[PDB]
Symmetry: C5
């Protein structure tokens, strides 16, 4: 018959979410409860009812006793897992109580940047049994699993946490146990508002103020320089994300400001060309130039907002 292995995983800290590399890093405690009757022992009066072991000698004890332990893997782990504690407490009964305190990076393959920076992402940790379900079956260790109260993450905000069990077929032909700790997190928009939206909007608004000066040459030079500023913001954004094969809401927004600014240069070159090809006309054309600018940006804003919502 298969022995129940009680898996518990608790994330104490989120040391960071690296969206460029699509991974996240946590400080966590893994807890396992497993009754192996073969490991049971008799004790004399005064001798302890609970034997405490360093994982190293406990595994050496299992090999001696010819017992198979529920060998597991953190399926989505990346790099080195720095350990803090790897402790076993064995009861007279044969109940193994294991605690694994670690710091580790995990793959975040659920990353969908299509609505960035208004995106919500899924992060998970996969704990797999190397041995199949006929030998060991993972069960949910009750009242332990989840996320702590001092995670230390400032940009992201965890919306919900879930735990479930599923099968995997990584090394075996038959199904094998898999414990899942899943969490959803959305972004704090403050950075994007302060460093990207407000500056881009200011550049556009204060640039429009200068149309009231009535100098066509100055306008063309202003829109030309604005175009270079947006090209620069385009690089600022690209540095936050991986070199995706798809368009972001942010990408569409920047490409949008390029297209409008390109057309502002085109329009004002065209209006100056009309002045040159024929006083009351001059001031009549000026009205189009001044009212074109806000209408072009308001038309662009309605285009993205429709294309993404």
């Amino acid at each position: 018959e298969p022995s129940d292995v009680f898996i518990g995983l608790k994330i104490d800290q989120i040391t960071g979410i690296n969206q460029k590399e699509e991974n996240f890093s946590v400080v966590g405690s893994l807890r396992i409860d497993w009754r192996q009757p073969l490991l049971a022992f008799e004790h004399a009066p005064g001798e302890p009812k609970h034997r405490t072991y360093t994982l190293a000698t406990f595994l050496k004890l299992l090999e001696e006793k010819q017992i198979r332990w529920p060998a597991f893997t953190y399926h989505n782990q990346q790099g080195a897992m720095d350990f803090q504690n790897r402790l076993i407490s064995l009861s007279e009964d044969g109940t193994v109580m294991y605690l694994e305190r670690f710091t580790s990076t995990f793959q975040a393959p659920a990353f969908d940047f299509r609505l960035f920076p208004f995106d919500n992402q899924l992060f998970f940790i996969h704990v797999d049994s190397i041995f199949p379900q006929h030998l060991f079956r993972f069960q949910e260790m009750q009242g332990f699993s989840g996320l702590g109260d001092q995670l230390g993450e400032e940009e992201w905000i965890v919306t919900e946490v879930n735990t479930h069990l599923t099968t995997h077929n990584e090394f075996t032909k038959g199904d094998a146990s898999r414990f899942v700790l899943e969490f959803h997190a959305e972004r704090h928009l403050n950075y994007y508002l302060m460093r990207i939206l407000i500056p881009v909007l200011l550049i556009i608004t204060v640039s429009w103020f200068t149309f009231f000066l009535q100098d066509y040459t100055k306008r063309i030079d202003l829109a030309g320089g604005n175009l270079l500023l947006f090209i620069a913001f385009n690089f600022t954004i690209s540095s936050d994300l991986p070199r995706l094969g798809y368009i972001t809401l942010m990408d569409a927004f920047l490409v949008g400001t390029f297209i409008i600014t390109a057309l502002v240069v085109l329009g004002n070159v065209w209006l100056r060309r009309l002045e040159n090809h024929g006083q009351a006309l001059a001031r009549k054309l000026d009205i189009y130039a001044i009212t074109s600018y806000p209408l072009a940006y308001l038309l662009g804003a309605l285009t993205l907002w429709l294309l993404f919502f």
Copy 2:
């Protein structure tokens, strides 16, 4: 009954405070005194009264003797703890004297940037007993704990150090011992004064000098370029901090310079529009333009200083 475990923690060095990642790094010595009568030994005349052990063989001796050691965790530790010394001295009595010299990063979840750069922060180290208070009770090892005299931190200045004991319920249902080393540190303002305040103030003051040249076009071009410079300083500041969900005193200060500069462009466009819509007037309007500038910045400065103090 529970055995007293004497915890002592001394921070020799502050290898750095990383405010972007909200963690800090220290070189520290952990000292433990624990009397276990079961570990007592008899010695012959001339044979040593104190046995010195490498942690590895000492733990192997405890497992042999079926003794439970006060297994502890640095609760707020992050990543790898690089060890220098892990030495045990066991007296004839059974008094275990442990020394743990390490370099490690620790989570700084008490980070409040709301008044940055005039902020004071709390940094702590949590040492938790894995076993509950019925088995082991942490006591304060007197005359050891604290912070050294060559911490090597240049930006920060430690205001006070404290040590206290508390309970935690991390792995157990019953209360478990927790030793706390807390320290408060405030910032040296010299960097911010030299690299941010003085430059921003100079750009504003020397830009005002040019108003006395009496060219409205040149003023609009000056404020426009100044706006771009502040957008650039805005990115310089954002790189020091995490992508917070809240507004900083620094953030308010930069958004403030944007708003005033935006209004300077607006005002000077408006004053040039007034000149155009009707000599003594010209020079009368000029007085408003020249006196507007200092009043706008002095009004902005009074707004933030009120909003934050």
Copy 3:
């Protein structure tokens, strides 16, 4: 006679491809099946038919039994290989079943940037037997080897995966077994289109719009500044690649924009010099200046497209 060693390698994750350093990083599982009759054992009823060992004690068992294991090396590995699992399952028969879960960087020496960013690259992992083919022969472990379904790579797209066996002569004079896991990957052009092509094309197109303003001085200043922008893009590109000894398609493209922009400055200086050396002429010369610009870029485009295709 030589014993068959069954090699299986599966890449679960592509943690990244670093083209500047010409290496790649993976999370992978190595699986080995090897029958050693000497390791066979007899068991009593109830005693397990499969013995599970930590690599450490299994190798200690081989040394004891004076047995030689199929010592292997990942020939193209770089730096530290962080291990997750190193587990042995030994059957009554003497069939050793080994699993090696690791994270590691590997040399990518097949990097050909000649057609970058339209390039396709070869990535491989070499598993070599230290002992020659007369002792051990590598065989392909069927139904395991390949690449997973959640690799997590966003810029690159895997076109095909292959496994084959070959000989090597690294440490021996006689041939020795080598297992190869090869994969081809092409690039997602979206980043290059959004951040390099569209901006460069916009700068060129909107700059041409201003020729219709009919100011020769303004044109020379525009082309001069455009040249500096391309010099800046030239540095942006150079940061993505190693300091190659050969010319890239991208390199040719940027050198191309330099040459045309240099000639635009030369041509417009020449046309202004013609105006100065002799009204209907002025406007006749203007036609050449305006039609020169698109023809020069269309001539350049045809030159690279011919030189590379």
Copy 4:
């Protein structure tokens, strides 16, 4: 009575001095000679007179023989100490000969940037005995300690090396031995001359050349832009140093160029305002403007040179 422990430390390489983090990194060999009569042995003819041990088994031999070794700590060490060799050679006499080859970062808390880049710094390595002077006394191992002949440091130049012994009271109430390897190093000014002094001086000198063009507006625009360039150099310098709480000679130098440039803008605005408020006057005022510039920078240079020397 106390046993003499002979400490020898030789720095083979200076892998770098990181002034921003106030630490330095070395490749070094630690050598210890210690006679423990208890470790003495008898040998048969043909059997070796010197027993060679890996530190691991030598410490296991000491624990067996119940001997206390002179446990030491590198007091100012930071992070991980990567070891190359840890070898023991035990003579028939009981003379332990230990060699420790390592790569490690050490705290440089003696960093005084007040006269940077004309600064001289003190770097040291502290080797402390964990046990007090009544048990073990550190002595200077003659003819070994110092700094090698291929250190590999290019910016810094070692002026002198010293070795001495002192007491410490880190873990004990009674004095404990401390071995000190100290070295002084001064900086090669070439980088600062080529990248900071020459450019700043050129910008100032070639900007003065344009005063001979006799355009007041052009001068104000030139000094304004120069001010921005110095603000940029100010950030270039700040990146080399920690965020100190004190003013550097370099800091004073840059603040100096700001103040003079601010006054150049002020003066030329004032002189243009004098022209406007009343031909031979014009050309008379021009002389003040042209001779002001060199006198202002020569007055600034005399101010810093007095304030720091």
Copy 5:
């Protein structure tokens, strides 16, 4: 008498050459052949003639047998040496066959940047015997040592490889064996040509084209801005190299462009001052201004080329 230790070192990969830190990184295989008659063993018919050992148990076997192994150090190694394989094969004879597969950084103290980027550098690996020549003598293991055929280095190109033996006196008074693997490598100029020479030459050439426009003010503004561009290229170069105490050919080249550009500003200010102090003169002076520019750069080019060749 002394026992011959056969050293073989083969570099499989050059993971990089870091010229800023003056070190290089390799993947290499170290091979040792050493006959120790004391390690010889007798075997029964059918029992193996070759015993295979993990370094750990082989060293434990040497300590047991009271044998001294040829303890060695990679003298110029830096940081951690990540190992792949550490395997021993012991023949009936007592012939120890050792293989050490590693990834490691090594000090490159032979770095001479005086002719950069036209420089050729020496890179080496030093393998030293800890024990002197009376105990162990290093010999060249024939047909193994050298550099592989898939080094993966793109900027550098290996000109020649050499192996030799020498003495050292690092830990001993008497001479001790040292094995040396040396290689010379020169640089691929393509990066410097594409990113530094072509842009600098273009800026100079296209700037000269505008002299034919005949505007003295525009020329002074052009040379002024060019000076700032070169100051920027000066920082781009400085980032590639350490903060050397000597002048590079590249450094001389950039300082050269500063001096000429400074003189171009000086000359054109002077020529405009001559126009102002006295039509056919105007156009006569113009010839000097236009022909000065190419002569000044051609004179500068001949100065460096003479000073360095």
